[PDB]
Amino acid sequence: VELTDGFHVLIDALKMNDIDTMYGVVGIPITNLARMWQDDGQRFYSFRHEQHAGYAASIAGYIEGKPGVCLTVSAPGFLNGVTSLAHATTNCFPMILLSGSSEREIVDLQQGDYEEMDQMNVARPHCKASFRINSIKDIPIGIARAVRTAVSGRPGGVYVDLPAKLFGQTISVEEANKLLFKPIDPAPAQIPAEDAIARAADLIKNAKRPVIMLGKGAAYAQCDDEIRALVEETGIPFLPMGMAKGLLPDNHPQSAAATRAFALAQCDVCVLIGARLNWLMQHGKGKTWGDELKKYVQIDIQANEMDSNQPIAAPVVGDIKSAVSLLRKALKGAPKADAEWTGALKAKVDGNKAKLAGKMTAETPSGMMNYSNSLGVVRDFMLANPDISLVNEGANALDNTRMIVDMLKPRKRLDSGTWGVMGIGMGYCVAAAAVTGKPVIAVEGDSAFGFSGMELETICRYNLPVTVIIMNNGGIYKGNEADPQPGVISCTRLTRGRYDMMMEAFGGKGYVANTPAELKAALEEAVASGKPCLINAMIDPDAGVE
């Protein structure tokens, strides 16, 4: 007798799968879905462009271990969001893009429907799976397939097409209750066999110059104690990848990060934990590895990732928590790494660390700070306040921040990722604030910032505790490239604008820092105020390198 509709069944299916937040932009034909979602008591963050709603979704998935959800309209909105879905998939971040689509009959004949596109098809190369839910009765199963696909195996993006006709369909309330359900164990553990473990243990026990590489896959796994115990019990030196920073504290005694180049070229046994031997690792080839094939151990949940670049002497397939637990049990009681090895690296590290300290104390003209002395301030602040998310992107602004700013806690550093994407900054800030409930600090190149800058309005609209630091050097890499022809500005130039004024235009707080002292003062006040702020840090136009 009593009926319910597509809108409500979808809302119930999402809540059923523990989804309480969605990021997106409204309009035909999903505006009423967002309203009812809010009316129902769940939260919806509206952005100014779908790409950045999608970037927020992708990083929410990385932080929480459950698919971040992005909602968009058809055709052009879908396309904007699919670019972020592709980013999630290459980064192995669980994410679900939900998009409304037009009429099946008109689209299938290419007659020119409103926002016409076979979105399901277009999405295929950018996600793990692309589905379409045509019937109200299939909503629970549909959402279940999406969640399982996004979080199981190698996590990634999933596209779910929602035809406009779906929302208006009806079904008896009694019937709808038989259909709704909660999937059991959507992200199962996958334990490797003992002989696989035994093989890796032996390579490790017999290594002379061993090293452990931690990738963001390890950080994602959320088994920080297992990995920390492994590193300290074996006494092996470790190197963290960009987003693996903080898994163990960056200033940990066993960190060989400060002497990476040397540690890699000299090691004989390299243990890869949730890290791909891709471009970020020079593919295991080149002088960075002393022009020789190392004996690799690799732990990854994706079986065919093994031998993708170089032969892997000890492949260990399964989830990181299960595998590390077994590897520790196999190495229990074995002698720690050789002191001459671990000692020769620490020495190197101390040298570089002392040298870096040398640049951070250097003086500069007002409004002409360089990367070392400006970032040194952020470094000191983060060490004192590690429970804050650090968003970071750019070129000089990225590489230097990764070198200078120490992370003491895991899953706090959120950067450009595998594709070296410019544009994740602001979306990453909304998601980090929304899912952590703690402050966020974003170190942005001024070029990188431009890709998502309008979202400052979103940060202000939701009054998030985000402090955006713009490394304003006036351009890409450098801010002083000469005019190619008299009267024409170089393509790498950017207006050394008042981004602080832009922030205030939407209700935020803005600062302008010309020296390390002003930067520190502004940063401390900004973060403590709990208000959305922007610090326009003036960097020497020539301080950067290409």
Place this chain on the structure above:
Amino acid sequence: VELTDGFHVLIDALKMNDIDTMYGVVGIPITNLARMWQDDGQRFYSFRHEQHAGYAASIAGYIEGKPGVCLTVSAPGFLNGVTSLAHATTNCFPMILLSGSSEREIVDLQQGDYEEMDQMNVARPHCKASFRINSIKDIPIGIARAVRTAVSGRPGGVYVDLPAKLFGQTISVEEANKLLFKPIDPAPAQIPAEDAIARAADLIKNAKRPVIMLGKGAAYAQCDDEIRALVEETGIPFLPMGMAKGLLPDNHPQSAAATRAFALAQCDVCVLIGARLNWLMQHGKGKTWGDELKKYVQIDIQANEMDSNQPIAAPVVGDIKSAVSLLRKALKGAPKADAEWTGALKAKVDGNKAKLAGKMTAETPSGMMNYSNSLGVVRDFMLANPDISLVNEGANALDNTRMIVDMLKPRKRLDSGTWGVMGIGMGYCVAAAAVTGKPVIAVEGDSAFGFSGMELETICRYNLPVTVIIMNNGGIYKGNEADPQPGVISCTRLTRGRYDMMMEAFGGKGYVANTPAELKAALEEAVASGKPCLINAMIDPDAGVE
């Protein structure tokens, strides 16, 4: 032996195909191509996001008749640009997307190369053709293929992949000069057969209530007088589609735009010229067409476009200039349309315009204008200053502007188009200014603006004569939607921001207009100044509709 590189051969090939402008964002691996393009005396507009450089290229193609060129980096940059390429293809705008790509060997084995992606195949569904130039000796033929594909037949987007190793290749100048060539007649005329024209002439002579529909395809054709000649000599009323406004002066005596519903519902014969019977026309059925199959004449360059929605009684395939010329000749001497038909429509138009006049005169509280009295100011300005491009996007801001602002010149109005895209705004402004060398006015909803607002900095960087008018009502459709839940802002709400301050943050001029008089004074000074300006028009948060 005098040698040359890939960079230069490509630059020469582009120049030979009459390209002298490129829109894009630099970085690995095409920064030097952009640099040398500039050194060579050609112009490159650097944007803050590739999607906008792409929208710029698409409209440049529309306005000029030659493909607009967008240049981007690999993977993520290319993806941002391809969203714009898809928009161009959908609207039939000539465009070429040039993107650098990575190493073939690494990408083909999916080993995790820098910015890895098979861009050539990812672009397939979004363009007319997707090519890749691997050898320096093939650059001349590749660019020629790209250009021809973009402008011939139904114009559209084309993707050209440029692997990094292409640029470094060398070849002797002698051989290079022997390969370089300019295609002959890239966009050839295609003349329809005599019977196709006679079939159309027949339907028109026997029409009791004929009407002409002009689409943007007609405007793109650039045969404004032939079309106007055909219209006047036949005495048949006409209706222009969104961007066809101005093909014939909007205030032309034969225009039935002010009574579209009655004209389309009561007509017996409808002549479509460069216009598709898609969603914009309710697919030629339903209440809007009186519920019966009219006898359609259609002139279009795409043969299989015929019978896509409704049976076409007189299909005329070929380029519009060639078709209209022959049709005009076939109708010379024939009796003009029925005066009792043309008279009834005229009376309807005069009636409705008088009705709109009363609205534009309405008085409103300061900071609370509605869409009639605010846009009435733009209307008057555009009637006095016809030679200005008008960019327009939004919902209420789009519909009301299309209805209120009369265009007196062709190809000046540039809006959301076929896909009703939000985000074309600022990109269109740059290209329009760039290719016309005249002033541009943009009427933007505040939500629409957010999709490309950061590019305001680009507009300032190039000191372009662009005036952006924000229809600030505070949200999507309306800015007063009540909190779905206490303390929770509705997903349709946007901050009623000081966009004027954002503009001034980059060196532009900002204004706030609370009344029609202030808007008028502001608009007149902004356009006259010839500098980058933004007018924050304060609209009643409850004036628009859903």
Place this chain on the structure above:
Amino acid sequence: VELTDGFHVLIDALKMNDIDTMYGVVGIPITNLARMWQDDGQRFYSFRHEQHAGYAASIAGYIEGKPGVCLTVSAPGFLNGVTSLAHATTNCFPMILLSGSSEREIVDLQQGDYEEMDQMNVARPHCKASFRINSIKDIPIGIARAVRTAVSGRPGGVYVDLPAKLFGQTISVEEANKLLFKPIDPAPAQIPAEDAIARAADLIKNAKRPVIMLGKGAAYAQCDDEIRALVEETGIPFLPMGMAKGLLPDNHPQSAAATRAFALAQCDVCVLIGARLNWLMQHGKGKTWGDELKKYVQIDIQANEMDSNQPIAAPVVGDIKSAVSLLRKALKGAPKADAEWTGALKAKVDGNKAKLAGKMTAETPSGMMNYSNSLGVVRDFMLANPDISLVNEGANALDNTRMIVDMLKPRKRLDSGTWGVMGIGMGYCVAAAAVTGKPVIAVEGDSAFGFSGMELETICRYNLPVTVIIMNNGGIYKGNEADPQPGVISCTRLTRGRYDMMMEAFGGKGYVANTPAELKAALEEAVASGKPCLINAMIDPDAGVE
């Protein structure tokens, strides 16, 4: 300096991954690869059409557990092979399709190269992964990637594009030998967590009417005794799917195959082992399941396969051998299934078998046998000669054979599979004979046979011990459909041909069987002879159903 070419490095890489057999068709540009493969002492089976070489490779992968390899030429040859690759992926059979391709430069510009096609991207939707090997130094890693992708996780097809220029490349033997390697543990075990197993144990101990469903995934796993052990120790009745027949002797006391409808409709708990809840099982709903959601246990290596059709109460993800072992241990000591449940089913089976016995005994006119008395002969032969592969395809010829012919050994029955494909017949015969070195019998409908009949010549060319039994009823389903119009043959009709003569045309032995006794004598002599034979069984044109 001793050099080597692409041909040889590839040959070595294949041999290193334990491949010693290839199925294909030669021509430009891979004729010499096949030649040298043979010179090297490896075997190559040349077929009359690539599609059949591909089906051969797919079943070789199923039977052995290592990818079957198919070799083809460019464009059209590759397309014929990819249809088979799609079939392998759908059925989860490990397979690698190696195809030569043309010139990158010409194809990438779509200039009309010899056999032009971007084969790598055309194969995308039909396989787990599509790679291309452009450099000789990458052959070792490429083949390793292909093999791992094919056998790990859910087994499937993989495409490897080999551009013509690959083979001509040279490299020193020293370096070549330094690159060649054999992957470690390509198909790793994946063990499920303790709670996943306990959840399953729980449902089974509380079941009042349990049933086990064995799919071909279980058979492919090759852990026949573990499965049989779990079945006997639990006393739970089982039902095998098409190719799972023989995993446990079909005449095993606990089999409920002879009363499937009642077992599936009346069960309360259903344990799926390497079997999907797809169309073959009515998607776990409707009349066949009594119209209620049973409590499903599922063991599968593909995590996102769970909840694909119906909610899975106890999902157990991991490889079947590892899962069944742990489950068996978790159930040891538990009470066997309800005797009043197992007893009722048994009585149903004995009843129906007796009923089938009477049919097989039925007498028929010469040249007009039905499906029972003809297949009853095959049944008896297969019970006496269990170690023979049985290929089977058709409609009535498939359904009746599946029901009548009992299999006593595992992985012997090879049929149409998941897609109900006609045309697997003759290809399966070649591979089965090739990898088993034992006799093969094929029960083919006459229509099904036509899809691969020309390969009879291939079977004769290699003097393989294959006996093909044609169920000659004269058409699709039936061979007596009346002329739709006078003198016009019905589209379901086929000539009641002398297929025996076709076989003898290529040197094979042909027989015609008009009665069960003649079929019996013919079958016994054909198999015993060990030569290629075909038996033309004359079936009543009106015996089958629609």
